[PDB]
């Protein structure tokens, strides 16, 4: 019964069987109650502020070949770009002028910048009195150390899938063990660390989703980014099925229940598979939004998956748009950098 599973989630009895049953039950009443539970936990632990992280996707060059990703090195049907360090710093300054209190720098795994150009950019943005989050992939410990000394605050490195076998198949350059080692290094170096996964990958099972939730809970990540897999036509997974929105939403809800004081975005991928999907997600456990701040002409060239929303509008539309979103949801913009505010419990 769904009622018993809800009761067990409310009492914090997070067993593998409870999580599996929550993900397996398709009843509308159960799902809606699960979403309401997550929404209420969010409100109680992290409040009504929705934190805005402005993302600058500064290079679409990548040395890796992940099977799901439109930026994979084997994709020749993509114009590659690199923003200059001046462009990046000035684009970050514009976001700070527009009210962003975190700047996220994301790229393909592009050797050009690494490590010293990143360090220089980070130092310049940190002068602006905002948080800096990096999302640059897997690099040596030394690189991560240099970026932390340069002033970076946070690092996003989704774990993608906690099934090592599936991970290696989808990410043939690397392994789950290396991904985890990177995440543990980042945590040791004092970053606020973000993990997370895709839902609906080819070959991924419900039990794999449970393992993603247990992985996240085990490592107590500061941020958890979850979205559906969206097939990209210039990849080997072009003909695979999209991930299910509702199932993905359930993963966000369960993440909030498991990690009640974490920061959880309503991802652009959620807003891409379903119109209004980010807004739904912000009402089912999420408390962060990441407006795209990549300038034209580059924005349209950074498509990990197709259909990405926010491409046709002026490149300064996203921050005002999310501020309108936050208001029409009855929520408030973040007042500070939106770092994790831990609530120690039992």
Ligand X SMILES: C[C@@]1(C(=O)O)N[C@H](C(=O)O)C[Se]1
Ligand Y SMILES: C[C@H]1O[C@@H](n2cnc3c(N)ncnc32)[C@H](O)[C@@H]1O
Q: Are strands 192-199 and 332-333 parallel, antiparallel or unpaired?
A: unpaired
Structure tokens belonging to residue 300: 């349209």
Per CB under 6 A, which of residues 157..186 are in contact with ligand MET?
157-158
Query: What, of ligand Y, Cl ion, ligand CPS, none, does residue 133 touch, CB below 5 to 8 Å by kind?
Result: Cl ion
Query: Measured between alpha carbons, how far is 114 from 189 in angstroms, rounded to an integer?
Result: 18
Backbone angles phi, psi at 292, to 5 degrees: -80, 125
- Pick between residue 198 and residue 257 the one whose CB is nearest to ligand Y: 198
Q: Does 32 bind ligand CPS (CB under 6 A)?
A: yes
Number of chain residues interacting with ligand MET (CB under 6 A): 9
Contact residues: ligand X, CB under 6 A:
55, 156, 225, 227, 265, 267-269, 290
Least Å from the CB of residue 97 to ligand CPS:
4
Using CB under 6 A, count the residues that bind ligand CPS: 22
Which of 122, 132, 137, 161: binder of ligand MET (CB under 6 A)? 137
How near is the Cβ of 304 to ligand X at its closest, in Å?
6
55 vs 257 by CB, closer to ligand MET: 55
One of 15, 97, 296, 300 touching ligand CPS (CB under 6 A) = 97
Asked if 133 touches Cl ion (CB under 5 A), the answer is yes
Residues numbered 219-248 forming contacts with ligand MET, rule: CB under 6 A: none
267 near Cl ion (CB under 5 A)? no
Residues numbered 78 to 97 that lie near ligand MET (CB under 6 A) are none
Kindly tell me which of 245 and 305 has the beta carbon lying closer to ligand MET: 305
As a whole number of angstroms, the distance between CA 242 and CA 244 comes to: 6
What residues line the site for Cl ion (CB under 5 A)? Answer: 53, 102, 133, 154
What residues line the site for ligand CPS (CB under 6 A)? Answer: 28, 31-32, 35-36, 39, 97-99, 245-246, 249, 274, 280, 283-284, 319-320, 323-324, 327, 333
What residues line the site for ligand Y (CB under 6 A)? Answer: 68-69, 158, 160, 198, 227, 229-230, 232, 269, 304-305
């Amino acid at each position: 019964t769904g009622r018993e599973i809800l009761e067990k989630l409310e009492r914090r009895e997070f067993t593998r069987e409870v999580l599996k049953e929550a993900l397996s039950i398709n009843d509308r009443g159960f799902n809606e109650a699960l979403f309401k539970l997550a929404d209420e936990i969010r409100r109680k632990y992290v409040g009504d502020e929705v934190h805005i992280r402005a993302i600058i996707e500064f290079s679409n060059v990548c040395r890796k070949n992940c099977l799901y990703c439109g930026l994979r090195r084997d994709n020749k049907n993509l114009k590659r770009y690199r923003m200059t360090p001046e462009e990046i710093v000035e684009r970050a300054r514009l976001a700070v002028q527009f009210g962003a209190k975190t700047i996220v720098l994301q790229s393909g795994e592009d050797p050009y910048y690494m490590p010293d150009v990143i360090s220089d950019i980070v130092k310049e943005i940190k002068k602006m009195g905002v948080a800096v989050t990096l999302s640059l992939g897997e690099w040596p410990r030394e690189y991560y150390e240099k970026w932390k000394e340069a002033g970076a605050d946070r690092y996003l490195l989704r774990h993608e899938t906690a099934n090592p076998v599936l991970h290696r198949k989808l990410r043939p350059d690397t392994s789950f063990e290396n991904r985890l080692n990177c995440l543990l290094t980042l945590k040791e170096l004092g970053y606020e660390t973000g993990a997370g996964s895709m839902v609906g990958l080819p070959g991924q099972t419900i039990d794999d989703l449970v393992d993603d939730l247990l992985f996240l809970k085990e490592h107590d990540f500061d941020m958890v980014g979850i979205g559906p897999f969206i097939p990209h036509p210039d990849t080997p997974l072009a003909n695979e099925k999209k991930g299910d929105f509702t199932l993905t939403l359930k993963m966000v809800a369960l993440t909030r229940i498991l990690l009640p004081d974490s920061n959880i975005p309503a991802t652009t991928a959620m807003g891409t598979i379903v119109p209004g999907g980010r807004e739904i997600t912000l009402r089912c456990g999420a408390n962060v939004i990441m407006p795209n701040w990549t300038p034209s002409p580059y924005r349209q060239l950074y498509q990990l998956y197709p259909g990405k929303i926010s491409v046709f509008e002026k490149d300064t539309a996203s921050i005002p748009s999310v501020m309108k979103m936050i208001e029409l949801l009855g929520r408030k913009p973040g007042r500070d950098w939106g770092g994790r505010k831990r609530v120690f419990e039992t």
